[PDB]
Structure 1
Amino acid sequence: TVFHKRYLKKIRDLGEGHFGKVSLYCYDPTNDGTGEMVAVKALKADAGPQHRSGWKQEIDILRTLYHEHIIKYKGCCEDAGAASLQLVMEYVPLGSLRDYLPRHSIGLAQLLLFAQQICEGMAYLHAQHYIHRNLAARNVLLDNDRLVKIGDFGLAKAVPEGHEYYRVREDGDSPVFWYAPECLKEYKFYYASDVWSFGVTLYELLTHCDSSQSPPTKFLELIGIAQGQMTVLRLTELLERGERLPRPDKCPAEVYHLMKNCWETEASFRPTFENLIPILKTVHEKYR
């Protein structure tokens, strides 16, 4: 599917993705204003060959993904400037949960439904032999009060059929506070590593994405802000000692134990996304 730059009418900037920026456009070829609203992710004009290789990979992954809980791929636009492809995706009306939740007091049952939907989209992603590597509330988008979709796949990678993990590099932009100990220490990203990130995401939902309760805030309170290059090493140490993010206010005990099960040190002791779907359906049923 092809989109024309001449028919794209910019409304506002939505935010910063991974390789570039996301903007809100109205694709209006008729010029009457009845055109559809699109979210266009563009690669920055000054990006090197390393980011351009990863950007093409992001588009290839999104194109091959088709799920109700994964952001819909609409097409691509011919970007004459920067000489790259602009990723055209569906506009999710309510936005990220990190922005929506601190302003809208959402019930426990609805939060548990979102977690179930995240697991539904993630199990499909894993069945397609892909890892997300960036599962967080800022990347989970809301369509309506009952529908959730996974948005940013900038760090998503394909795990080969034979292998069970993917070896990662030493990067500054890595969401370390959402990462399992095997990602920080051995630089290995398993399917079980995404489950750890879900637990951290579930923690964010229960806190209603309160920035003073966020994982970088709580972990740096335990690490300390003056530890040189040893922030990640100190983070690895406390996780090895069994220290975890605290139980959120008004969060049920069994739900916190499920969060702690997603946060098991040994990756094999962690439930798969397919294991979490019947569980979260039952948990949501109890609180609805």
Structure 2
Amino acid sequence: PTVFHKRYLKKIRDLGEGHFGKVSLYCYDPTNDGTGEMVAVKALKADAGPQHRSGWKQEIDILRTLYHEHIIKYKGCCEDAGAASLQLVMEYVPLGSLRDYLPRHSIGLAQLLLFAQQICEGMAYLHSQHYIHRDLAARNVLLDNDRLVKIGDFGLAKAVPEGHEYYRVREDGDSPVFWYAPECLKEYKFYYASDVWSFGVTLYELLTHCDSSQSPPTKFLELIGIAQGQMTVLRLTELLERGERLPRPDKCPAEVYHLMKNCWETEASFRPTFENLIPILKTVHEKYQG
């Protein structure tokens, strides 16, 4: 409901961008004095079509309903007269994404497990509100302080229909395939369990400290190869169906790797839910925090 008046918005730097969206940091100063609040502003590119324009409206609506300690804070909207859509004004998360953060900050296993737990809390919340995320990756997890993590982007989030257990996707070129379960790649259906597979990939990223050479696209493309034309996805699907998985990250405990493998069961019904993961991670965290 909060309206941001464009006249007090001053652009500081870009925070990120995608094919149809862009996030920039702004100081919102209705005085030009020392009370200026830092905000993250997501805008939809003016050249986006009706599909993305309606998806944007839906994305804005999704963030307005969402309220949880491990979900980025919705702040308000304002008129993007330049793009004739609204702008999503959210809180500014200071330390960035774990993808930006982890390669430069040697973080302990215990803090990593705490992040993992917090991601599950935020996700079990999203799923209780009958929404699937569809883009759960370390790049979408913002670090507030060394003990507070938040899911900070919902560009692909969708409402799970009333009499349904999954959503029909209709796959595109922007689809994060290396974070996707077999049922997503193959049957074009995204379940609540499909987000759990993606969490297993995010957990692998956390345990590799988001090292680019150890990344899911890097490791999967090494296994599939690159002379494989129009068949990266088919070859990814079949390696997953043969039981092939991302390797065990160096210094990752065997029990935690087992948990990652359990999130990556080929059979979606065999995967734990996020509500199931919370007591398990709470307990594995305490264990390594000692």
Quickly name the TM-score band, shorter chain normalised: over 0.9
Residue 19 of structure 1 and its aligned partner are, at CA, apart by: 2.8
CA offsets 1:237-256 (integer angstroms, 9 cap, x no match): 00000000000010000000
Q: How far, CA to CA, are the matches of 2:55 and 2:83 in structure 1? A: 15
Residue 170 of structure 1 and its aligned partner are, at CA, apart by: 2.2
Q: How far, CA to CA, are the matches of 1:273 and 1:129 in structure 2? A: 13
Structure 2 residue aligned with 1:265 = 266
Q: How far, CA to CA, are the matches of 1:192 and 1:206 in structure 2? A: 21
DSSP 3-state at the match of 2:104: coil
1:17–1:154 contact (8 Å) kept in structure 2? no
Q: How far, CA to CA, are the matches of 2:18 and 2:127 in structure 1? A: 22
Residue 129 of structure 1 and its aligned partner are, at CA, apart by: 0.3
Structure 2 residue aligned with 1:26 = 27
CA offsets 1:219-277 (integer angstroms, 9 cap, x no match): 00000111111100000000000000000010000000000000000000000000000
CA offsets 1:31-72 (integer angstroms, 9 cap, x no match): 114211000001111111111111111100000000000011
Residue 18 of structure 1 and its aligned partner are, at CA, apart by: 5.7
CA offsets 1:4-29 (integer angstroms, 9 cap, x no match): 11100110001114631000000000
CA offsets 1:146-165 (integer angstroms, 9 cap, x no match): 00000110000000132000
CA offsets 1:116-142 (integer angstroms, 9 cap, x no match): 000000001000000000000000000
Residue 78 of structure 1 and its aligned partner are, at CA, apart by: 1.4
Structure 2 residue aligned with 1:158 = 159
Q: How far, CA to CA, are the matches of 1:244 and 1:96 in structure 2? A: 25
What is the aligned-residue RMSD (CA, Å)? 0.7
1:136–1:198 contact (8 Å) kept in structure 2? yes
Cα gap change, 1:269 to 1:214, in 2 (>3 Å): same
Cα gap change, 1:164 to 1:18, in 2 (>3 Å): farther
Q: Report percent identity of matched pairs.
A: 99
TM-score, structure 2 normalization: 0.98
Paired residues, number: 288
Q: How far, CA to CA, are the matches of 1:119 and 1:47 in structure 2? A: 32
Q: Which deviates more, 24-33 or 199-208?
A: 24-33
CA offsets 1:155-184 (integer angstroms, 9 cap, x no match): 000001320000101200000000000000
Cα gap change, 1:158 to 1:18, in 2 (>3 Å): farther
In structure 1, runs of 5+ residues without a counterpart are: none
In structure 2, runs of 5+ residues without a counterpart are: none
1:137–1:201 contact (8 Å) kept in structure 2? yes
DSSP 3-state at the match of 2:214: coil
Q: How far, CA to CA, are the matches of 1:33 and 1:215 in structure 2? A: 43
Q: Which deviates more, 179-188 or 32-41?
A: 32-41
Q: How far, CA to CA, are the matches of 1:157 and 1:47 in structure 2? A: 19
Q: How far, CA to CA, are the matches of 2:6 and 2:191 in structure 1? A: 39
Q: How far, CA to CA, are the matches of 2:146 and 2:201 in structure 1? A: 21
Which structure: greater helix fraction? 2
Q: How far, CA to CA, are the matches of 1:101 and 1:136 in structure 2? A: 13
DSSP 3-state at the match of 2:149: strand
1:19–1:154 contact (8 Å) kept in structure 2? no
Q: How far, CA to CA, are the matches of 2:83 and 2:52 in structure 1? A: 12
- Aligned ranges 1:174-213 → 2 under 5 Å: 174-213=175-214
Q: How far, CA to CA, are the matches of 1:19 and 1:143 in structure 2? A: 26
Q: How far, CA to CA, are the matches of 2:234 and 2:105 in structure 1? A: 36
1:10–1:24 contact (8 Å) kept in structure 2? yes
Q: How far, CA to CA, are the matches of 1:170 and 1:66 in structure 2? A: 29
DSSP 3-state at the match of 2:279: helix
Q: How far, CA to CA, are the matches of 2:127 and 2:46 in structure 1? A: 32
Q: How far, CA to CA, are the matches of 1:82 and 1:41 in structure 2? A: 12
1:18–1:154 contact (8 Å) kept in structure 2? no
1:18–1:155 contact (8 Å) kept in structure 2? no
DSSP 3-state at the match of 1:95: coil
CA offsets 1:70-129 (integer angstroms, 9 cap, x no match): 011000011111110000000001110000000000000000000000000000100000
1:26–1:38 contact (8 Å) kept in structure 2? yes
1:132–1:153 contact (8 Å) kept in structure 2? yes
DSSP 3-state at the match of 2:139: coil
Q: How far, CA to CA, are the matches of 1:40 and 1:261 in structure 2? A: 37
Q: How far, CA to CA, are the matches of 1:127 and 1:20 in structure 2? A: 27
TM-score, structure 1 normalization: 0.99
